[PDB]
Ligand binder design. Structure first.
Ligand SMILES: N[C@@](CCCO)(CCCC[B-](O)(O)O)C(=O)O
Ligand SMILES: N[C@@](CCCO)(CCCC[B-](O)(O)O)C(=O)O
Ligand SMILES: N[C@@](CCCO)(CCCC[B-](O)(O)O)C(=O)O
Ligand SMILES: [Mn+2]
Ligand SMILES: [Mn+2]
Ligand SMILES: [Mn+2]
Ligand SMILES: [Mn+2]
Ligand SMILES: [Mn+2]
Ligand SMILES: [Mn+2]
Lengths: 314, 314, 314
């Protein structure tokens, strides 16, 4: 049995729009913890992390809010590793995607052999030097990869970081808005990816088979799934900062997570970029939070074919 | 050539919302019979069944409107078998899904070797004892299966029933909202199913190939298709009682029926759960009835690649 | 490197609704030429063709505006062949689909071995004799096919025409609204097609593999892609004359064009039937023009996985 540790990460400074810091509140109020308990699940809430304001935080070159972003990830890393040490699956509710730096980092402290599956419209792999936006939620993978050590300058707020994953340890699913520099890195390091082009080519069934085979063929290992909700089409998750049309369907989102759940190796989870303030209507907000919740429940056992307890129902 | 017998079943007491009893009217007014005649088809309307009110109908334990539901199915069974005896494909317009008890029962009187394909978001396989809702449109399969004889109590209105199909004789397509007890039965009896998980895994092309192979591999036999319109995503069929997101597409709905039509073994058809009263707008109603009509026309020969008469057009 | 020649064809008389003549303006104002230059592309605008009014143009039997349609295609053919002779990929912005007669004709003057891929909800293969609508945008393929020489009467405005393609040289993708006579021709001449039925059966990945194999297996040859925007579902391209539900997705549209681009044999392109006047709202217009632009950019190299210049980004 899956045991769970819920971590709230109400943080927005990895990008411009503020509303994403509310993601944990709105997911919680949607009944997340309750529905989890409704299923197989033993849930422990570690609360929402308290991130002190860092009011003196001028850009580093063009990188924005570097100390605030870096400290928020540091604090998160500590709480993830703690949850992992407590033998629980970590569930991080964001919060912008810059927090993956901390989530993946703390996870890797307890499980250095983790493999990452990254569900997203973006590769989030810009370095502080290749970024044009300066937004750190567009940079988390660059900091985590060993191969890029040599390419990440010393950014204030980030000296605690030590890249914990190799290019071989991550698979992207969903890409459809990749910066040229990101694409250069992607191709140079030979990272496994399934852009929407591949999903279209192969079908989500084969995508997940290749993804799981690629990460677990050699050896079973813990899986960290970093789910940016903008990975799904904005018709399912509109309330988000950087939506891109041509996204994954609701069905595909549920199939990805259904398949991961079934490995029995889900070890860390991030549910990121829900910005309720960005819904053009109250129904767009509910649709977004509802989808986010459903993705999460699938990650912990809720299957479309149904579920039952080990009793005789007749 | 396909010959057709249309049966109206304006009945709602298998579930709480009343508007589904209008389904036959709105489908008819959408031009159903006319469009059928527009294609290959010889159509005979047997009219809308007249279901006397049964005003004394208190719950049986928690099962609601049992006599009304049971009598409505009894009457329907008689009219189906009659249509079948007239050598026609039976086309039942519902009406809530509890009527499948009668539709499948009467069909099986003339063709005891029928195989059932059930298109639906639900398994509709609760027994009177496993149901939590007490709604009979959630129970029709339990009554029909031989394997569950021993598990169905004596419910008033249902003593005429004799289970006519085995677990091996039905394939479900579309499942995404299955009760635990239903899932227990599903797994215990080893019923062939393709939940939305399987459709996602395999693609609808392989789903229909396995479905038709599984039912007809051994021997050709008549096919009964029980189509709950909530099997399709509510973006195509919103005007319905129990909608569930992540449904089959319009395209998939048409591919399922296109493929069935092409077997030349369609023998019975149910078009169920259209509730025009449940459309939030008049366009949602039209979209629902339009989809329902299109599914039906495909079932009787209308193909997306086109159709032509056996003449030289040039 | 792809070099491009843009040809505006503001013409509507192949069908009843006038607004399609604006397609070139609205596509241009959406930044088409600029975004092309933003990518690999050397762009030359040949301007919008000026089509003199032909005010005396009574039906030929039931065929409408025959001289106007025929002259507009004649003029277009001249400008395509000119662009082709300048060693550029021709990009025709329509304009109704009747213009394909000229686009394909002029293209074939410089490249008689062209193969055609036709993305559309319709086969547009009615002859002047099989048509029931009399609308010429429903007839362009009949005029182009050698096999139908003998079946096309002498229609005023069309004596300059000489059928340049054989039945073997065209593949249709998307069909879902085919007239009986069209279906007769389709089946009689043995034309390669993937209706929505095939796309559903096979998945777009296999559709494009079979399409490209079928056209290029024997020999590499230039490709002409005639893209009717009604080929995509009206949820992506609503602002159009003859929309049909159950269309290709946005994703499929981009996968088709991504795959064609990658052959490096795209030689001619038509982007047809955008009617901004037919959007029920200003957002429906933008959605339509946006989709049209995106399809086009994919045709000239813009890939979902990303793109980068041949430099070292790190
Ligand atoms: N790549 C972007 C856009 C670049 C524009 O030139 C977007 C990053 C999105 C971050 B996410 O967490 O949402 O995926 C960036 O800001 O780095
Ligand atoms: N399984 C349901 C819900 C159970 C809630 O605990 C739904 C049945 C739907 C019947 B249908 O004909 O629409 O598929 C039931 O009422 O039995
Ligand atoms: N086949 C149609 C409808 C026939 C009705 O009987 C439609 C032609 C559409 C032309 B398009 O360029 O849009 O695909 C025709 O006008 O020929
Ligand atoms: Mn993203
Ligand atoms: Mn992201
Ligand atoms: Mn149902
Ligand atoms: Mn049902
Ligand atoms: Mn068309
Ligand atoms: Mn067309």
């Amino acid at each position: 049995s899956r045991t769970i540790g819920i971590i709230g990460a109400p943080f927005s400074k990895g990008q411009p729009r503020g509303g994403v810091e509310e993601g944990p509140t709105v997911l919680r109020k949607a009944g997340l913890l309750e529905k989890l308990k409704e299923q197989e699940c033993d849930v422990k809430d570690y609360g929402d992390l308290p991130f002190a304001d860092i009011p003196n935080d001028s850009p580093f070159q063009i990188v924005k809010n570097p100390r605030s972003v870096g400290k928020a990830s540091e604090q998160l890393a500590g709480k993830v590793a703690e949850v992992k040490k407590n033998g629980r699956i970590s569930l991080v509710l964001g919060g912008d995607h810059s927090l993956a730096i901390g989530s993946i980092s703390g996870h890797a402290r307890v499980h250095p052999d983790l493999g990452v599956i990254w569900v997203d419209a973006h590769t989030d792999i810009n370095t502080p030097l290749t970024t044009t936006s300066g937004n750190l939620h567009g940079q988390p993978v660059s900091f985590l990869l060993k191969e890029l050590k040599g390419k990440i300058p010393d950014v204030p707020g980030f000296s605690w970081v030590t890249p914990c994953i190799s290019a071989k340890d991550i698979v992207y699913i969903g890409l459809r808005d990749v910066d040229p520099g990101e694409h250069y890195i992607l191709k140079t390091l030979g990272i496994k990816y399934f852009s929407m082009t591949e999903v279209d080519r192969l079908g989500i069934g084969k995508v997940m088979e290749e993804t799981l085979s690629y990460l677990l063929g050699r050896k079973k290992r813990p899986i960290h799934l970093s789910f940016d909700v903008d990975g799904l089409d904005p018709s399912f998750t509109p309330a988000t900062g950087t939506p891109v049309v041509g996204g994954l369907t609701y069905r595909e989102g549920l199939y990805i997570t259904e398949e991961i759940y079934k490995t029995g190796l889900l070890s860390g989870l991030d549910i990121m970029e829900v910005n309720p303030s960005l819904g053009k209507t109250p129904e767009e907000v509910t649709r977004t939070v509802n989808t986010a919740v459903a993705i999460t429940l699938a990650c912990f056992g809720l299957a479309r074919e149904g579920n039952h307890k080990p009793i005789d129902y007749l």
